[PDB]
Design a protein around this nucleic acid. Structure first.
Lengths: 91, 94, 97, 520, 105, 95, 106, 81, 96
DNA sequence: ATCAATATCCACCTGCAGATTCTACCAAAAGTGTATTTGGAAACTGCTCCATCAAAAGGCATGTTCAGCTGAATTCAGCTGAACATGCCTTTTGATGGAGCAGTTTCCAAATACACTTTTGGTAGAATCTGCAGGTGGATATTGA
DNA sequence: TCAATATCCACCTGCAGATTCTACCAAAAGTGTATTTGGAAACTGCTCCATCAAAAGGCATGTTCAGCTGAATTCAGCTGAACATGCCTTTTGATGGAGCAGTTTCCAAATACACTTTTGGTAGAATCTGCAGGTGGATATTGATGG
C-alpha cells in the first residue's frame, strides 16, 4: 500500500487493560465503594467484557438482520431493551 | 426524505403549561421522547393482549383502563385512569 | 507533611462522582475493546460514534449499579472493602449467574 | 510532427485538466520520493504524462499509435502496481475514459477508423494427452514448445493463464496506416488485390469490389427460404424505420444416427423390446441482417429431425438441441418477436412435412458457457430458467393463436396423458437429459417410478408441442457439424461476438469459411 | 374545524397516537376512545415528571432541566422509581447515597 | 354442548414416541409440556414481529423467525435450531 | 394425494396450526409460507431435546414414566436450557439437590 | 376458624419452605418477615389477577388469570395454562 | 439417643429437595387469599385450580428466595439466616 | 482547644454552541362524510362448579437442654489508600477518501381472498392395561456414644 | 465398633390414571383461481465513518510509606435444634344454587375510501440566552500540632 500500510485492519489486543485501575476506581466510587481490593479490578473487567460480549453480539446479529455493515445505535437500543436494560437518550 | 415524528411540540406545550419559565435540553428532550414512546408501546401491547384474553377484537377505552391500572403503580394510576376518563368524558360531550 | 487519613479522600471522590455525571471510562480504550469484541464475533464491521457512546453510558450504568449492589453486599458482611465474593453474590442474586 | 502536435494536444490537455485525477501522473514517480521502492523493480518502462508531453514537443512521434500505446501503457502499469481500492486506480480509470471519449473522434479525423488499443479475450487452450478436456483459465498449466499444453492432473514450464492476445492490424497500399482488421472489415480472401482504406477510395472515386462471400450468396433451401420470407413479411408489416431485410440460410444438413446407451441396451434392445439405434437428420440454420451494409449473424439453431422411416417412439419428431443469438438485431424492440417468428416458421415448415411432435429443452447456460456464438457481449443478460420458460410460452401461445401449433405441455403431463408405462416409450434424442440420466439411474415399474419422479422434478424445463419427404438435398459441412467445431474455430482464430464490430468480423470470417468449405 | 385533541381537551395529538397504535398492528380494530385515553395518560405522566424535574432544577439553582435533573426527579419518587426500576437515565448519574458505616461516625 | 379446546398435545406425544417408544407422560407433566411449547411459540413469534417492525418489513417470513432463534435460543440450541429450520424449509420447498 | 405441509416438510408438529395461530396472533397482517414450517421445526426441536433429557433423568431415577420432577432435573442440569428457563417456574418440579460447602459438617 | 390468617400460615410451614430452600438454621425473626414477603407477593398476584377478572366482567377468578398474573410479574407458571 | 443439631436439619434438607409435594396447608392459604381478595373487591369466588396455582407459584418464589438468602448468609461467613439476609436478597433482586 | 494547609462554595463575567423566534412549503396527517360490516350489548337459560359442613386423620403448638453457632474482644501481616514524579496517550480540531447507507422505478414471485372437498383433531363412553404409591420384610451405611 | 432409625431397594399388589379402539363431524387444511403488492435489483445521491496529522496536558503508570481493615484466634451468652407430649385444624366427600358460557336480535360503532383542509417538520438566517470555564477570596473540613 502507498498510504502507510495496506488494508491495515490492525487486529486488536490488550484492550481490556485499557480499562485502567483509576477508571474502575471511579466506577466503584460512583457506586459508593470506599475500599477496593487489588483483585477487584480484573474481575470487574471480566464482568464488563461479558456484558459487552452479550450486548455487542445481540446488536451485531440485529445489524446483519438489517443487511447492514455498520453498527448503529438503534439496534443497540433494541439489544439492551431485550436484555432488560431499557436505555434513554439514544432513540 | 422520510419524516421522523416526535412529541416535541406537545411535550413543550405541557412544559410551558406546568413550568412557563423553564427550558429543556436536547438530551433531556430525547429522554422525554423515548419515555413517552416506551409508555405508549407498553400500554398498547398490554391492552392488545387483554383484547386477546377475552376474545375481544376491538380496542376500546376499557382495556386501556385495565392496562393503566396494571402497569402504573397505585397512586399514579389513581390519577392517570381518572384523567383519561375525563378526556373521554369530554370526547363524549359533543 | 500534611496527610489525610484513609477514607476522607475516599468520601471526597464519592461525593464528587455522585454529584457529577461525566463519563468515567476513557472513550478510546473502550472503543478499542468494542472493536476487539465485534471482530471476535464478526470481522469487517463499522461502528457509529453514537453507538459507541450508547455502549459507554450503558456499561457505566451497569457497572455503577453492580457496584452499588456490591457495596450493599459488603456492608451486609460487616465489611467496608469490596471483595470478589461480593460481586459474585450480587450477580448470583440478580440471576445472570 | 507539429501538425500531429496540433492533432493530439487537445486530448492530452483535457486529460491534464482532470483534477485531481491527473495529479499523480503529472510528474515522474520516484520510488524513494514516494516511499514505494518496489515500483521500478516490477515494471521495466518508467514514464508519465510529462514524458509524452516532451516527446510531442520534441516531435519524435512518427505515428499516433505510438502515442496511444504509450498512454494505454501507463494506464496498464498504473493498474498493475495498484490496489483496486486505491484512489489512483479510480483516477486512472477516469483518465482512461476521458482519453477514449476525447480521442475517438479526433483520431477519426486524422483518417484512422478508431484509436483504441484493444486486446482479445483470454484465449483458453485445450489439452493434448487425454484429447477430451481443455486447459482451465486462470490456473496452473504446463506448456512445451508453445504447441503442447497440459493441465495439472494430466501429466501426474509452470505458469498461470493470464496472457492477452492483442488485436491484429493491416496496412494500406497508399497510406501504410496500421488499421484495425476488425474495424475496417478487410478479409484477405475476399479482396486479394490489396487493402485500401476508405479515404483513398473516396479520393480516387473507387468502390470496393462486390463481396461474393455474403450470406445472400449462400445456396438457398426451402426451409431457409420459407424462414426468410416469413421474417421479411413480418418486418414489412411492422414497417419500422430501423428494420432491415433478414437472410436465413441452412448451412448444414446431414443424416446421422443416435445409439442406445449400454445401460438400457442390455435391458431392452438385447431382450427384444427397443430399437438398437435411431436415424435422424441434423440441420444448422443461421439468421443474418444487413446492418450498415454489412452482413451480421444474429441467430443460430440446431435441430434433429426423425422422419417417417424411423423406429418408434422417435418417429415423426423434431427436437431443438441448441439455439443461440446475439442481441445486435435492429430494431431492438422487434428482436425478440423476430426470434419467435423463426421459432414459429420452422415448426410450420415441419408441419407441412408431416411431423407431429416437437421437443424443446429450455435450459439457460451456466456462467461463461456459450452454445454457438463465442464470447457473448458482457451486457447481454442471460435469461433465468423461468424467464426462458415464459419466453418459450409466449411463442407457443402466438403459434396456437395462428393455428400452427395445436397445443403444448410439459413432459410429465404429456407422459401422464400418454399413459406411459416403460422407459422404452420415451423419445430418444442425441445429447438430451433423459438418455444420460436413464443410464445414470440404472447404475444407481422398477424404472418407471424413477423416471416419473424425474419428470416431476423438472416438468417445466421440457416442452412437448403437438403439431416425410424433405425437398432440400443434403448439405455436407464439417465446420457446422455440431457447435463444437464452430466454437473451436472461433476460439482458435479469435472470432468473438462481444462487440458489434467483432460480431461483424466473425460473421465475415464464418461466411468465408462456409463458402470455401464447399470447394473440393 | 375542531381537532380531536382540542375536542377532548388533549395536548398530545390524538390523531398521531391513534395512527401510531394502528401502525404497530396491536389489533385489527381500534375504537375512538382508546387513543384519546392513552394520549391523556401521556399528558398526565409527562406533566408529573416535568414538575419533578423542574423542582429538581430549581433546587439546583437551575432554570433549564437537564438529564441529571430528570434522574434526580425519577429516583426521588418511589412510584416513578418502581415504574422505571429496570431503567437508566443517560447522563443522569445516581442519587447521593452513602451507607452509615462508611461515615467516620 | 361440546366445546373443543386446541393443544399441541398429540404432536408432542408422537415426538415422545419418536424419541422414546416405551415412555409415557403424565397429565400434569403433559400440561407442563403444552405450556412450555406455547411459551416458546409466543416468544419466537413476538420477537419475529419485533424484528419486522424494526427493519420496516410488513411481511413475516422464515428469515426473521430464524433471527429470533439466534437472539433468543442459546448458542448450541440456536445453531442446531437454525439447522432443522433450513432443512425443513428446503424440504417443503422441494416438496 | 393432498400431502400435508407437515409431511411435506418431514415434521410432526402441525404447520397449518402454527400458521393459523400466528395469523390470529395479529403479529402481522401477512404471513409467509415457510414461516410456519420453520417455527414448527424449532418448537419440535426444543420439545425433542427436552424429551431426551427428561427421559435420561427418568432412566437415572429408575422410572419409565417421565414426571415433572424429571423435567425440572433435565432443564436445570443443562445450563443452556437453564438460562432458557431462568425466569420460568415449573409445576411439581422441585429444586436440584444442592448442599452448601460451609453448611457441611467438619 | 381463627382470624388474621397471616399468622395462620404456621411457623413449621415456613420451616419446611426454608428446608426446601436449603436453610438449616432459622432465626426467630425469620417467620414474620417471610410471612410479610409472602403476603406482599400475594396482594400483587391478587390485584392484577382480579383486575384481569373485572376486565372479563366476571365475578369468579380463574386459574388461567393466575397464570396471566404470574407471567406478567415475570414468574411464568406452567401446568395451569 | 439424640441427634446432633444439623444432622436432622440436613436430613430434612434432602427430604424436601427430593420431594415436590405441597408444603403450605391448603386451607390457611385459601383463607388468606380470600381476605386479600376481599381487601380489593367484595364477593369473589375462586377456582380450586386458581388457589393451587397461586400456592404453588408462591412456594416456588419463596423457595428461590430462601436459596438467595442462604447464599447471602453464607456470604457473611455464616450458616444462619437473619432479617438482614432477606433485606439484602430482596434489594439485590430489586422488588423494593 | 487553637491553628495551618486544602478542599468547598460560590458570586461574577465573558465567549458561544445550543436553545428559542419567524417565513414558507407541503405531503403526510388530520378531519368530515356515506356505504358497509359485525362486535358486542341485552335477555333467557342450561350447566359447571363454587360455597358450606361433618367426621377421619395427619400432623401442629409447647417445654427442656445443651451443642454448637454467633458475636464480642485482641492482634498483626500486609495491602491498599494518599501523595508525587514522569510522561503518555488520549483528547480536540481539521481535512479527506469512499465504503456504504439510503431515495426512486419496475414488476414479478409470493402473498392474500374465498370456494370447495378432504381428513383430521377434539370429545364421549367401555373396558383392558399398567407405573407406581405405599405396606411389610430385611438390612445396610451411620452416626451418637 | 453394638445399637436405634430413616431410608434404597427387592418385591408386591390395587388402582387412578395412562393407553387402545370405533364413531362423528364441525373445524381446519390443502388445492384452485383470481387479484394485489413488497421489496429485490439497478442506479445513483449523499451523510457519515474510517483514516491521517499534529499539539499538549489530564490523568495513567509507577514507586513509597504507613493506617487501619481484613483475617485469624479465643471464648462466653444464648438462640435455635432435636424431641417427647398433647389435640385440633385440615382434608375429603357430599350437596344446594351464584354465575360461566351457549343462543338470538339488533343497533351503536368501527373500517373503507375519496376529498379537502390543517400543520409538524424544517431549510435557512437572525437574534437571544443559560451556563461552560476561569478568577478570586470567603468558609467549612481535617489532622495533629503547642500543651
Amino acid at each position: 500500500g502507498k498510504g502507510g500500510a495496506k488494508r491495515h485492519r490492525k487486529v486488536l489486543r490488550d484492550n481490556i487493560q485499557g480499562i485502567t485501575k483509576p477508571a474502575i476506581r471511579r466506577l466503584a466510587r460512583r457506586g459508593g465503594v470506599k475500599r477496593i481490593s487489588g483483585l477487584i479490578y480484573e474481575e470487574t473487567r471480566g464482568v464488563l467484557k461479558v456484558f459487552l460480549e452479550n450486548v455487542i453480539r445481540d446488536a451485531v446479529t440485529y445489524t446483519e438482520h438489517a443487511k447492514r455493515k455498520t453498527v448503529t445505535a438503534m439496534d443497540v437500543v433494541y439489544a439492551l431493551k431485550r436484555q432488560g436494560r431499557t436505555l434513554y437518550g439514544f432513540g | 426524505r422520510s419524516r421522523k415524528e416526535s412529541y416535541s411540540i406537545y411535550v413543550y406545550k405541557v412544559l410551558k403549561q406546568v413550568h412557563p419559565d423553564t427550558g429543556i435540553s436536547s438530551k433531556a428532550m430525547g429522554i422525554m421522547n423515548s419515555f413517552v414512546n416506551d409508555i405508549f408501546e407498553r400500554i398498547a401491547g398490554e391492552a392488545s393482549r387483554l383484547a386477546h384474553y377475552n376474545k375481544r377484537s376491538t380496542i376500546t377505552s376499557r382495556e386501556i383502563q385495565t392496562a393503566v391500572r396494571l402497569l402504573l403503580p397505585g397512586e399514579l394510576a389513581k390519577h392517570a385512569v381518572s384523567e383519561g376518563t375525563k378526556a373521554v368524558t369530554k370526547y363524549t360531550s359533543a | 507533611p500534611h496527610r489525610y487519613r484513609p477514607g476522607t479522600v475516599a468520601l471526597r471522590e464519592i461525593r464528587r462522582y455522585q454529584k457529577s455525571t461525566e463519563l468515567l471510562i476513557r472513550k478510546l480504550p473502550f472503543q478499542r475493546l468494542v472493536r476487539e469484541i465485534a471482530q471476535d464475533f464478526k470481522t469487517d464491521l463499522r461502528f457509529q460514534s453514537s453507538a459507541v457512546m450508547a455502549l459507554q453510558e450503558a456499561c457505566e450504568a451497569y457497572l455503577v449499579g453492580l457496584f452499588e449492589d456490591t457495596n450493599l453486599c459488603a456492608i451486609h458482611a460487616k465489611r467496608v472493602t469490596i471483595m470478589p465474593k461480593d460481586i459474585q453474590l450480587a450477580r448470583r442474586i440478580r440471576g445472570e449467574r | 510532427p507539429e501538425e500531429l502536435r496540433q492533432a493530439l494536444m487537445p486530448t492530452l490537455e483535457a486529460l491534464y485538466r482532470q483534477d485531481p485525477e491527473s495529479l499523480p501522473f503529472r510528474q515522474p514517480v520516484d520510488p524513494q520520493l514516494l516511499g514505494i521502492p518496489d515500483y521500478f523493480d516490477i515494471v521495466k518502462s518508467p514514464m508519465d504524462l510529462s514524458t509524452i508531453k516532451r516527446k510531442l514537443d520534441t516531435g519524435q512521434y512518427q505515428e499516433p499509435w505510438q502515442y496511444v500505446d504509450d498512454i494505454w501503457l501507463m494506464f496498464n502499469n498504473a493498474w498493475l502496481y495498484n490496489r483496486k481500492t486505491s484512489r489512483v486506480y479510480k483516477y486512472c480509470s477516469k483518465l482512461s475514459e476521458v482519453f477514449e471519449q476525447e480521442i475517438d473522434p479526433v483520431m477519426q479525423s486524422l483518417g484512422y477508423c478508431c484509436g483504441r488499443k484493444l486486446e482479445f479475450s483470454p484465449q483458453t487452450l485445450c489439452c493434448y494427452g487425454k484429447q477430451l478436456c481443455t486447459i482451465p483459465r486462470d490456473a496452473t498449466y504446463y506448456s512445451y514448445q508453445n504447441r503442447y499444453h497440459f493441465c495439472e492432473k494430466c501429466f501426474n514450464s509452470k505458469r498461470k493463464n493470464d496472457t492477452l492476445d492483442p488485436e491484429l492490424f493491416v496496412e494500406c497500399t497508399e497510406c501504410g496506416r496500421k488499421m484495425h482488421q476488425i474495424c475496417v472489415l478487410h478479409h484477405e480472401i475476399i479482396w486479394p488485390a490489396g487493402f485500401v482504406c476508405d479515404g483513398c477510395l473516396k479520393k480516387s472515386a473507387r468502390t470496393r469490389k462486390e463481396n461474393k462471400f455474403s450470406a445472400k450468396r449462400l445456396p438457398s433451401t426451402r426451409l431457409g427460404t420459407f424462414l426468410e420470407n416469413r421474417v421479411n413479411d413480418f418486418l414489412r408489416r411492422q414497417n419500422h424505420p430501423e428494420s432491415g431485410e433478414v437472410t436465413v440460410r441452412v448451412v448444414h444438413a446431414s443424416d446421422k444416427t443416435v445409439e442406445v446407451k449400454p445401460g438400457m441396451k442390455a435391458r431392452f434392445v438385447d431382450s427384444g423390446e427397443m430399437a438398437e439405434s435411431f436415424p435422424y437428420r441434423t440441420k444448422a440454420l443461421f439468421a443474418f441482417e444487413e446492418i450498415d451494409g454489412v452482413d451480421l449473424c444474429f441467430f443460430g439453431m440446431h435441430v434433429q429431425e426423425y422422419g417417417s422411416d424411423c423406429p418408434p417412439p422417435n418417429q415423426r419428431r423434431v427436437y431443438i438441441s441448441y439455439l443461440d443469438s446475439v442481441h445486435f438485431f435492429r430494431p431492438k424492440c422487434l428482436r425478440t418477436a423476430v426470434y419467435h417468428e423463426i421459432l414459429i416458421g420452422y415448426l410450420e415448415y415441419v408441419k407441412k412435412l408431416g411431423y407431429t411432435t416437437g421437443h424443446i429443452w429450455a435450459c439457460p447456460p451456466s456462467e461463461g458457457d456459450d452454445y454457438i456464438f463465442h464470447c457473448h457481449p458482457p451486457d447481454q443478460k442471460i435469461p433465468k430458467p423461468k424467464r426462458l420458460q415464459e419466453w418459450y410460452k409466449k411463442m407457443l401461445d402466438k403459434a396456437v393463436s395462428e393455428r400452427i401449433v395445436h397445443d403444448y405441455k410439459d413432459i410429465f403431463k404429456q407422459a401422464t396423458e400418454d399413459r406411459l408405462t416403460s422407459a422404452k416409450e420415451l423419445p430418444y434424442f442425441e445429447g438430451d437429459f433423459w438418455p444420460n440420466v436413464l443410464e445414470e439411474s440404472i447404475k444407481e415399474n422398477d424404472l418407471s417410478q424413477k423416471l416419473y419422479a424425474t419428470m416431476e422434478k423438472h416438468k417445466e424445463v421440457f416442452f412437448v408441442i403437438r403439431l416425410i419427404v424433405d425437398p432440400d438435398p443434403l448439405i455436407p459441412c464439417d465446420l457446422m457439424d455440431g457447435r463444437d467445431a464452430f466454437l473451436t474455430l472461433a476460439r482458435d482464430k479469435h472470432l468473438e461476438f462481444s462487440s458489434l464490430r467483432r460480431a461483424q468480423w466473425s460473421t465475415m470470417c464464418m461466411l468465408v469459411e462456409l463458402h470455401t468449405q464447399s470447394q473440393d | 374545524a375542531k381537532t380531536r385533541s382540542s375536542r377532548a381537551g388533549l395536548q398530545f395529538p390524538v390523531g398521531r397516537v391513534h395512527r401510531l397504535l394502528r401502525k404497530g398492528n396491536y389489533s385489527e380494530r381500534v375504537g375512538a376512545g382508546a387513543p384519546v385515553y392513552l394520549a391523556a395518560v401521556l399528558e398526565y405522566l409527562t406533566a408529573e415528571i416535568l414538575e419533578l424535574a423542574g423542582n429538581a432544577a430549581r433546587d439546583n439553582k437551575k432554570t433549564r432541566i437537564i438529564p441529571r435533573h430528570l434522574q434526580l426527579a425519577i429516583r426521588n419518587d418511589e412510584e416513578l422509581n418502581k415504574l422505571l426500576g429496570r431503567v437508566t437515565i443517560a447522563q443522569g448519574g445516581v442519587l447521593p447515597n452513602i451507607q452509615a458505616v462508611l461515615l467516620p461516625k
